[PDB]
Amino acid sequence: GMRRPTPTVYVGRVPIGGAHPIAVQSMTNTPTRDVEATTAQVLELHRAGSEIVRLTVNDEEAAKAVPEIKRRLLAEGAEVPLVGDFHFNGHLLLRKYPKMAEALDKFRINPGTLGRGRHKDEHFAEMIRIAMDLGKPVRIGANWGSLDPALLTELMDRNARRPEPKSAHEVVLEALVESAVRAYEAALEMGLGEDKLVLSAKVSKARDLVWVYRELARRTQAPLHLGLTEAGMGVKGIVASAAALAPLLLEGIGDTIRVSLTPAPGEPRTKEVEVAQEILQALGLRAFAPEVTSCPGCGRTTSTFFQELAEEVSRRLKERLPEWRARYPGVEELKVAVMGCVVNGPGESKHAHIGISLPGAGEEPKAPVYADGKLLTILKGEGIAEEFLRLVEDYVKTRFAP
Amino acid sequence: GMRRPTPTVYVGRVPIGGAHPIAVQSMTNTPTRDVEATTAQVLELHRAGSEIVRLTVNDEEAAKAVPEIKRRLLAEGAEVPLVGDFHFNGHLLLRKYPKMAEALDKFRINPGTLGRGRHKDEHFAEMIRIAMDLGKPVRIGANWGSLDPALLTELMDRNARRPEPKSAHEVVLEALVESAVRAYEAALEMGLGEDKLVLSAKVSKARDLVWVYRELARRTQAPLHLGLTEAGMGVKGIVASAAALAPLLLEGIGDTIRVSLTPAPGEPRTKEVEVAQEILQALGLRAFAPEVTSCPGCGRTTSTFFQELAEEVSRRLKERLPEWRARYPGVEELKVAVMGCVVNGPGESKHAHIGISLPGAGEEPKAPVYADGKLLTILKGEGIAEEFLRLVEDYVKTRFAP
Numbered sequence: 001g002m003r004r005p006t007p008t009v010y011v012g013r014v015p016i017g018g019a020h021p022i023a024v025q026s027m028t029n030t031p032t033r034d035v036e037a038t039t040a041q042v043l044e045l046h047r048a049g050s051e052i053v054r055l056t057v058n059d060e061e062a063a064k065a066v067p068e069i070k071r072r073l074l075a076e077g078a079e080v081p082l083v084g085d086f087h088f089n090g091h092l093l094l095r096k097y098p099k100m101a102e103a104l105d106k107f108r109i110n111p112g113t114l115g116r117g118r119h120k121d122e123h124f125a126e127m128i129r130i131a132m133d134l135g136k137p138v139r140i141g142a143n144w145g146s147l148d149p150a151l152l153t154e155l156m157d158r159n160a161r162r163p164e165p166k167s168a169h170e171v172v173l174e175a176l177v178e179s180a181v182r183a184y185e186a187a188l189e190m191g192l193g194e195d196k197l198v199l200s201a202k203v204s205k206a207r208d209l210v211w212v213y214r215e216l217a218r219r220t221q222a223p224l225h226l227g228l229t230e231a232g233m234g235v236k237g238i239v240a241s242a243a244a245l246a247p248l249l250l251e252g253i254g255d256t257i258r259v260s261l262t263p264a265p266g267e268p269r270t271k272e273v274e275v276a277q278e279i280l281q282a283l284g285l286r287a288f289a290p291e292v293t294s295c296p297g298c299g300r301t302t303s304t305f306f307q308e309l310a311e312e313v314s315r316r317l318k319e320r321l322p323e324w325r326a327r328y329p330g331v332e333e334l335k336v337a338v339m340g341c342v343v344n345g346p347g348e349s350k351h352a353h354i355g356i357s358l359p360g361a362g363e364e365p366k367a368p369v370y371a372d373g374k375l376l377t378i379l380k381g382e383g384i385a386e387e388f389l390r391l392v393e394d395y396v397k398t399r400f401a402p
Numbered sequence: 403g404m405r406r407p408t409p410t411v412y413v414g415r416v417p418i419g420g421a422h423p424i425a426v427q428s429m430t431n432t433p434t435r436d437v438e439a440t441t442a443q444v445l446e447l448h449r450a451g452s453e454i455v456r457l458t459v460n461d462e463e464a465a466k467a468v469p470e471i472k473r474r475l476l477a478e479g480a481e482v483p484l485v486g487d488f489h490f491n492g493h494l495l496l497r498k499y500p501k502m503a504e505a506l507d508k509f510r511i512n513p514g515t516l517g518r519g520r521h522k523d524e525h526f527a528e529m530i531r532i533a534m535d536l537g538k539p540v541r542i543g544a545n546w547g548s549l550d551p552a553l554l555t556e557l558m559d560r561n562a563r564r565p566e567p568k569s570a571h572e573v574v575l576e577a578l579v580e581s582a583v584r585a586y587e588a589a590l591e592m593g594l595g596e597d598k599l600v601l602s603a604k605v606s607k608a609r610d611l612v613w614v615y616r617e618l619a620r621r622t623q624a625p626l627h628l629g630l631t632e633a634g635m636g637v638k639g640i641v642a643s644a645a646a647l648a649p650l651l652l653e654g655i656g657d658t659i660r661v662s663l664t665p666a667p668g669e670p671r672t673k674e675v676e677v678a679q680e681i682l683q684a685l686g687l688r689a690f691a692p693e694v695t696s697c698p699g700c701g702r703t704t705s706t707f708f709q710e711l712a713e714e715v716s717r718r719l720k721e722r723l724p725e726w727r728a729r730y731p732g733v734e735e736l737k738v739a740v741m742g743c744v745v746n747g748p749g750e751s752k753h754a755h756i757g758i759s760l761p762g763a764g765e766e767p768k769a770p771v772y773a774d775g776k777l778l779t780i781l782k783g784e785g786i787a788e789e790f791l792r793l794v795e796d797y798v799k800t801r802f803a804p
């Protein structure tokens with residue numbers, strides 16, 4: 001499909017923009033002052049597949065901790081770029097702690113959390129000046145939870161002058177886009193390079209996000225950071241995130257993504273990285289790991305045996321991945337089918353790299369295996385699972401041989 | 403947004419089509435012969451919100467059980483329409499067991515599982531004849547796991563004659579659409595009403611599904627049953643389902659949906675109904691239950707307290723829903739915010755019906771609550787959670803009073 005062309009912005013060693021794979025990022029939830037906790041969580045997130053990690057730089061204690069966090073990450077060869085999240089006092093922290101400024105790989109600015117009235121433009125310029133001095137890229141990140149009140153008022157008035165005014169909600173979305181686009185144009189006029197600017201403008205409802213990002217994509221040339229903000233907890237958060245991003249990503253809009261889930265108490269922060277990966281992979285945009293295609297099962301197959309086989313295949317693939325990723329470049333693209341009966345079993349299996357079709361009700365007790373679209377063997381008896389996994393291993397060795 | 407206009411097809415008492423809410427359906431996985439197990443699961447699915455329930459009618463024993471299943475459902479006032487899923491021997495079962503034919507509310511036919519060569523058209527006509535006799539609606543449901551081989555061959559040849567032939571994969575998608583569209587046109591020519599025909603053409607990859615359904619929507623006037631077939635297990639299944647459907651639903655394509663997840667061993671079959679609901683609600687197309695908007699939390703808030711509050715609010719809303727749904731019509735639209743700090747807390751809360759913003763790091767220990775966009779109160783001390791839930795209850799009573 002189409003991918004929107006953009007200049008390349010390097011965030012540390014990671015390039016983002018239309019010429020590069022869409023990058024997965026995340027954000028810590030440890031207090032940034034706590035150097036031990038924050039370093040450990042940055043590493044955890046990076047190991048799960050966060051190519052870029054953001055951390056809040058909220059107060060002086062946080063700022064003073066950043067250089068030590070960066071130092072520890074580098075000591076273990078962990079080249080993970082760090083993004084500093086600034087609100088209200090970004091200009092003061094970057095001025096007062098130049099070592100923190102230099103240790104970050106990117107600054108995030110929010111045009112609605114710069115200061116009130118006259119403070120705004122001066123605080124903005126000071127942060128942009130510092131980024132230009134140190135050669136750092138910046139994300140200008142608008143969020144409708146912190147929308148600039150004076151800009152909203154300006155656009156509400158323009159709207160009230162229209163022959164047919166739009167709803168309050170539509171004007172809020174207009175204002176959000178305008179906040180980002182105006183600050184983008186200001187930073188460029190100040191001399192920040194096109195290769196140093198990423199944009200976002202996040203809302204918490206899927207259909208609104210699609211409208212906003214279509215506007216941003218039309219009105220600017222910058223790489224876009226895409227996310228549904230405040231997506232929430234559990235299945236609701238996951239579904240909403242996937243639903244909001246998909247229409248945009250299929251249209252070629254978006255260069256980096258973050259999934260904004262509320263973790264359940266005791267649930268790992270890495271869940272959001274796993275979801276981000278699954279969105280990109282489901283849309284054919286990146287490949288992170290082999291995936292199992294399996295039917296829901298119905299009354300045509302025995303539910304327990306089928307469900308346990310599919311689960312067993314999935315678990316084994318996950319167990320082998322670290323090894324396979326090292327020996328068999330390209331293996332991330334592998335598609336394995338596990339199907340419940342003859343209705344769609346063979347056909348789906350033939351569309352996979354390798355697939356097995358169980359015998360359902362009414363059929364003789366044997367399971368055909370297909371690979372590269374043709375019959376490979378027919379399994380029977382116990383250890384169907386072990387025999388199929390051995391076939392998958394052998395197929396991987398042969399196809400993804402260096 | 404846009405909704406594609408279509409005639410209305412009644413599936414039992416449930417209308418589907420462009421004038422009606424998008425209907426959620428599911429499918430049993432019990433052996434249909436087992437009357438007790440199947441009835442119980444139909445009820446379970448319906449209670450979770452499956453407006454229509456499909457069951458496989460695969461052999462003579464299944465067919466003989468359907469009338470008794472329908473009888474038991476009606477005895478408890480459970481008006482849930484049943485869809486019969488037929489493959490290979492549909493024509494024989496419908497002819498041989500007219501009581502089963504009459505007990506179903508809809509027949510599903512697959513144009514790739516009718517029989518080979520010459521059998522196809524005669525088996526198709528016999529099933530359509532029976533549906534016309536009994537006034538039953540039919541879904542003509544194509545699936546790329548069971549694609550008609552002779553049609554594929556026909557389209558592969560047409561493709562090989564093109565000045566620039568398309569890939570094998572693109573021709574498969576062409577053939578899938580063609581299978582559904584041709585059978586649609588055949589059924590109409592036989593005299594089945596436009597008010598009796600629903601179409602589907604499912605594939606297991608998201609970007610392919612979007613292409614297919616855009617073609618179906620253009621080429622036919624029928625209500626469309628939308629689903630990503632064989633979506634698989636766990637988070638992968640959920641994400642893929644949401645990602646595939648969203649672009650279509652936002653464009654106004656789709657009149658009923660089914661989510662095709664593989665259950666984990668021991669996991670309830672109702673999970674797919676919950677996911678379907680969440681997709682529709684995330685896109686603003688239906689409202690099933692109040693939803694909590696919450697931030698991911700970062701280093702600006704204390705992670706445990708915030709995460710436990712958000713979880714507590716969610717659990718309480720879920721506890722009250724059966725009652726609230728009965729007393730407060732419209733309450734399904736309720737949006738509650740639970741936010742971690744002052745950065746986006748107030749703003750997001752003001753966009754909700756009612757929201758609370760916790761104090762983060764550096765702030766005085768108090769939590770503003772907003773309702774209908776303005777400050778309602780400020781909470782402090784212990785029992786913030788209980789006090790906020792009491793405010794949510796009071797807000798619901800006042801706004802959603804009959």
Ligand SMILES: C[C+](CO)[C@H](O)COP(=O)(O)OP(=O)(O)O
Nearest residue numbers: 141142143229230258260697746
């Ligand atoms: C981190 C904080 C600052 O706006 C937000 O509340 C949550 O993060 P998010 O959903 O990734 O949204 P942002 O890109 O930070 O605007």
Ligand SMILES: C[C+](CO)[C@H](O)COP(=O)(O)OP(=O)(O)O
Nearest residue numbers: 295344543544545631632660662
């Ligand atoms: C039930 C069976 C018949 O094609 C499939 O394997 C799975 O169900 P599904 O994903 O809902 O797809 P269908 O609408 O049944 O084609």
Ligand code: SF4
Nearest residue numbers: 295297298340341343
């Ligand atoms: S492949 Fe067979 S068992 Fe699986 S859902 Fe389809 S028809 Fe049912």
Ligand code: SF4
Nearest residue numbers: 697699700742743745
């Ligand atoms: S609202 Fe505050 S605590 Fe929550 S994610 Fe945003 S900045 Fe962090």
